[PDB]
Amino acid sequence: YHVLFDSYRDNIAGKSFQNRLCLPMPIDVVYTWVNGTDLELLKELQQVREQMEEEQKEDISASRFEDNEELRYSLRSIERHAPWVRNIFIVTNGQIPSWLNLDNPRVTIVTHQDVFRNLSHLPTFSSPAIESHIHRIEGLSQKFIYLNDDVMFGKDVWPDDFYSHSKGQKVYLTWPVTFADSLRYVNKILNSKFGFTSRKVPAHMPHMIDRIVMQELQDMFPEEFDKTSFHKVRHSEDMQFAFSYFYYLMSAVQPLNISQVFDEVDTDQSGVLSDREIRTLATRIHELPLSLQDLTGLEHMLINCSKMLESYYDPNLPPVTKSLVTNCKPVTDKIHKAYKDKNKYRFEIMGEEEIAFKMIRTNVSHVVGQLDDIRKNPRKFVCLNDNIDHNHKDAQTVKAVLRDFYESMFPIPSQFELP
Amino acid sequence: YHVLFDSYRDNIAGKSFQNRLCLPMPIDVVYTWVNGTDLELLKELQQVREQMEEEQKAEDISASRFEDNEELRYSLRSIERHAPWVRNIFIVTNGQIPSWLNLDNPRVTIVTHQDVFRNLSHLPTFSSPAIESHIHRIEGLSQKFIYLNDDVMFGKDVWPDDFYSHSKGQKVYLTWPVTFADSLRYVNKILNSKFGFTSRKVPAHMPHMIDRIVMQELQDMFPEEFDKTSFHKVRHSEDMQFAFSYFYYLMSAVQPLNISQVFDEVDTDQSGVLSDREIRTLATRIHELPLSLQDLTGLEHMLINCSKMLESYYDPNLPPVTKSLVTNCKPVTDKIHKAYKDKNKYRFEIMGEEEIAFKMIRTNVSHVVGQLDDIRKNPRKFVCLNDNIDHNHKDAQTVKAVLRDFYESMFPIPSQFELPREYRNRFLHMHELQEWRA
Ligand SMILES: CC(=O)N[C@H]1[C@@H](OP(=O)(O)OP(=O)(O)OC[C@H]2O[C@@H](n3ccc(=O)[nH]c3=O)[C@H](O)[C@@H]2O)O[C@H](CO)[C@@H](O)[C@@H]1O
Ligand SMILES: CC(=O)N[C@H]1[C@@H](OP(=O)(O)OP(=O)(O)OC[C@H]2O[C@@H](n3ccc(=O)[nH]c3=O)[C@H](O)[C@@H]2O)O[C@H](CO)[C@@H](O)[C@@H]1O
Ligand SMILES: *[C@@H]1O[C@H](CO)[C@@H](O[C@@H]2O[C@H](CO)[C@@H](O)[C@H](O)[C@H]2NC(C)=O)[C@H](O)[C@H]1NC(C)=O
Ligand SMILES: *[C@@H]1O[C@H](CO)[C@@H](O)[C@H](O)[C@H]1NC(C)=O
Ligand SMILES: *[C@@H]1O[C@H](CO)[C@@H](O)[C@H](O)[C@H]1NC(C)=O
Ligand SMILES: *[C@@H]1O[C@H](CO)[C@@H](O)[C@H](O)[C@H]1NC(C)=O
Ligand SMILES: *[C@@H]1O[C@H](CO)[C@@H](O)[C@H](O)[C@H]1NC(C)=O
Ligand SMILES: *[C@@H]1O[C@H](CO)[C@@H](O)[C@H](O)[C@H]1NC(C)=O
Ligand SMILES: *[C@@H]1O[C@H](CO)[C@@H](O)[C@H](O)[C@H]1NC(C)=O
Ligand SMILES: [Ca+2]
Ligand SMILES: [Ca+2]
Ligand SMILES: [Mg+2]
Ligand SMILES: [Mg+2]
Ligand SMILES: [Mg+2]
Ligand SMILES: [Mg+2]
């Protein structure tokens, strides 16, 4: 209300910090949904025949394209635990769920036609290739949550669970470093670019993605992401969606700005460094404990720069202006050496305590046990990956168990369902 | 206006979640400040003379407990620079008024011990814990407020995210396991008696965010010893520490188990009757994994028996499992109590001491200079310079000068709460000002 709006300027500064107190909104959810239809196996079988026909002179296991009713219950989980989401985007080959309520303005189907920039990759059948273009959806919010169609919210989620203005995005990591091969390939690329370091793969969970950061990452590696889009099957040489994005967010650096250093040392907004400001600059430049020798050396460097181009204790010291510091080679050299490289983005490394990731390894008793483990300990993010044979007789029993578990957690039909 | 208001209703639910997204507002700052005036020194000598005659029948008074090292001025400057979101500032001054304070500013207010203590029988307080025991009683104070110690200040840049988050509650900054140490041990024994034995760590010397409701509940839970620490006229060995008690009440307040809530969180159908899937969820919650068929069968047998005493299930004789049937079923409720461990009433988030700068100013120039340089090299969110100066050594003046120079390097620009250097408050006490008005 008007009283609520004026309350933001009711502080000592007489200014509104609503953009700094209210979390980044609006936020959208993007899904990648694939189904094995009558016209999808036919196009799938065209590619598989030409894969092994040339190289001599497993990825495609039907668990990559099978519906276990996971999208419907993921949408129900969003409606139940994340009611703050604005719009839902479902990215498909043109397949539309038989139960999806297209008349609902909040949910839209986005075909690969509108997503891929170069349409010579339309028969995709590859999650990394589709995900590399997931940030190009028209009308997408700058902050959006990418859902993997197996992941869903289990307990309750708020934008604070992904992003904080103070510490930036939350990065949930797991065990260190086709999926493993792609992880190692991206790890080598990041070692070449940002330097050698140890990395840990992000958890299987809804990922918050910034469109600007993702676009900058893809501009930094145009050829790698073009190759990722080119492939029609998950390959060892494609950029993993979450690993590359999060370890670019955590590794991107910003060039040091001497003007910013001067402004943050010159605390009185005068443009000239006083004795105290020179002292704090010397402290930030040299290595503690500070001695009179270091301060005298800094004074000598400033005096020499002045000769070769308020009141002070040293009578020979000129007024230390921003120009005198920026145009001084040794002082700027010391600034560049002492100041460690700063990250362009803020991030907060988290743990996997609130993430329930489980693989459905076609065993009815074990599947029931792990679903019961989810039931007893409700976690914030739940992932149920498909490792079923889909030809075994137990496959239908496993699907029934999963459907019963889903119905137990989310029985109420969502607004995205045809009545 | 309306465009901004309609933004929060633009979601799948169609509701506004602004209260869950936009942090707790407003937030106020409370200061406790004391000056070594002649009038205060006269009352100080009365207590110490009576203090000596008490111990003869069978330091908490030293000047470092009361001396003004100009820390309040630079703390207000730090608030104006790094925490511009604060609404109002309250200073509890023992009736005094800082000479440089600009009382004409409507965002700074002097509150005296008269309006703070419950009864006026121990007004000559001279004890920080006693004054802190009534901080939450300030009229017009916001529900969540940050208590400033007049020598702690904001160092880098702070936001309400550094104190509170809706998802994870208040942030608790703990440093190391447990007169100040004696008070910590006393409160630790009290908490061991009340909430049970555990390992505890003292909160950091920093701006502490306090909720008025939580503090009032804590003081209602321990009325006798809070009144005891209230009526002490000197910092005492056995008194309730302000931050330790509040934070380990926030982290230890448990809430009694509610069977209706458990049923509602298991009955996801919102129908009032547990289905077979919901009964399996309840069995998983109660029993220890793996959930054998024997355990579920036993649960079903217990439900059937207790139904006999007073949507098609697998058991044809199993009645509809209603909420009333579960609440009136003694064995399943006992097993729920034995399985569901006690949940905390308040949500909190334990933090580290990485962004906290706490140092002891132990009247050595070569060491104070090094410590302040360490602050200069590595800015931190919260900086505390705790007074430990000898105050009779010749180096006290030089140490004060070094501290003032460090403060001026950090915050040179005068704040909005200061009078111009050519002006000064006419009266240094509230009662004199009231006499001047009337
Ligand atoms: C939560 C998480 O970290 N998920 C990652 C995981 O997925 P995972 O290994 O679980 O890959 P899935 O088989 O679940 O496929 C991932 C997603 O791609 C979709 N899909 C798949 C094939 C297809 O032709 N069309 C289509 O849209 C699925 O519907 C699903 O939404 O490893 C993949 C390969 O590194 C990544 O791409 C995924 O982001
Ligand atoms: C940041 C922090 O955790 N500080 C705690 C620390 O303070 P510490 O041991 O540093 O206590 P100080 O000497 O700084 O005094 C604390 C506060 O009380 C004020 N004061 C003191 C004496 C007096 O007669 N009037 C008056 O108003 C001071 O101005 C200051 O605001 O240990 C005390 C022991 O109980 C606690 O109470 C303080 O909360
Ligand atoms: C996913 O693909 C399957 C397989 O094509 C679809 O199931 C078909 O649905 C149509 C329309 O109702 C029926 O006429 C066919 O008999 C079904 N085929 C099979 C093999 O079951 C299904 O509708 C697609 N969509 C979803 C959301 O699962
Ligand atoms: C699209 O990709 C194909 C891959 O063969 C390439 O030949 C073509 O040039 C690309 N199109 C554009 C417009 O870059
Ligand atoms: C299925 O899991 C159970 C334990 O739940 C195990 O004993 C059994 O051997 C598994 N069956 C197969 C075929 O691997
Ligand atoms: C503290 O009290 C002394 C005692 O005379 C007085 O001179 C001084 O102005 C007071 N200080 C402040 C900061 O108000
Ligand atoms: C002041 O405090 C208590 C209540 O907190 C009151 O009953 C008591 O009489 C007063 N103290 C003394 C010493 O009379
Ligand atoms: C349990 O929670 C419900 C929520 O509606 C509340 O009405 C009820 O009083 C609670 N039961 C108790 C406190 O015994
Ligand atoms: C102050 O510390 C220095 C070393 O930092 C030491 O040499 C000196 O003796 C100390 N002075 C006192 C009075 O303790
Ligand atoms: Ca200056
Ligand atoms: Ca039910
Ligand atoms: Mg799948
Ligand atoms: Mg998956
Ligand atoms: Mg003090
Ligand atoms: Mg102190």
Residue numbers in the entry:
A (entry chain B): 49 to 105, 316 to 435, 930 to 1061, 1076 to 1185
B (entry chain A): 49 to 106, 316 to 435, 930 to 1061, 1076 to 1203
Question: What sentences appear in the manuscript?
Answer:
PTase is the key enzyme of the mannose 6-phosphate (M6P) targeting system that is responsible for tagging lysosomal hydrolases with the M6P moiety for their delivery to the lysosome. First, GlcNAc-1-phosphotransferase (PTase) transfers GlcNAc-1-phosphate (GlcNAc-1-P) from UDP-GlcNAc to mannose residues on the high mannose glycans of the hydrolases, following which the GlcNAc moiety is removed by uncovering enzyme to generate the M6P monoester. The α and β subunits are transcribed and translated from the GNPTAB gene as a precursor molecule that is cleaved by site-1 protease (S1P) at Lys-928 to generate the individual subunits, a critical step for the activation of the molecule.
To determine if this region is necessary, we resolved the cryo-EM structure of hPTase in the presence of the nucleotide donor sugar UDP-GlcNAc at an average resolution of 2.9 Å. The GlcNAc moiety H-bonds with Glu-389 via the neighboring O3 and O4 hydroxyls. The α-phosphate of the UDP-GlcNAc forms a salt bridge with Arg-322 and Arg-986, and the α- and β-phosphates each contribute an oxygen atom to coordinate with Mn2+ (Mn1), as does Asp-408 (the last residue in the NDD motif) and Asn-1151. Also visible in our structure are the hydrogen bonds between the ribose O2′ and O3′ hydroxyl groups of the UDP-GlcNAc and Thr-80 and Asn-406, respectively. Strikingly, the binding of UDP-GlcNAc extends the ordered structure of the N-termini of CR2 an additional seven residues, from Phe-323 to Glu-316.
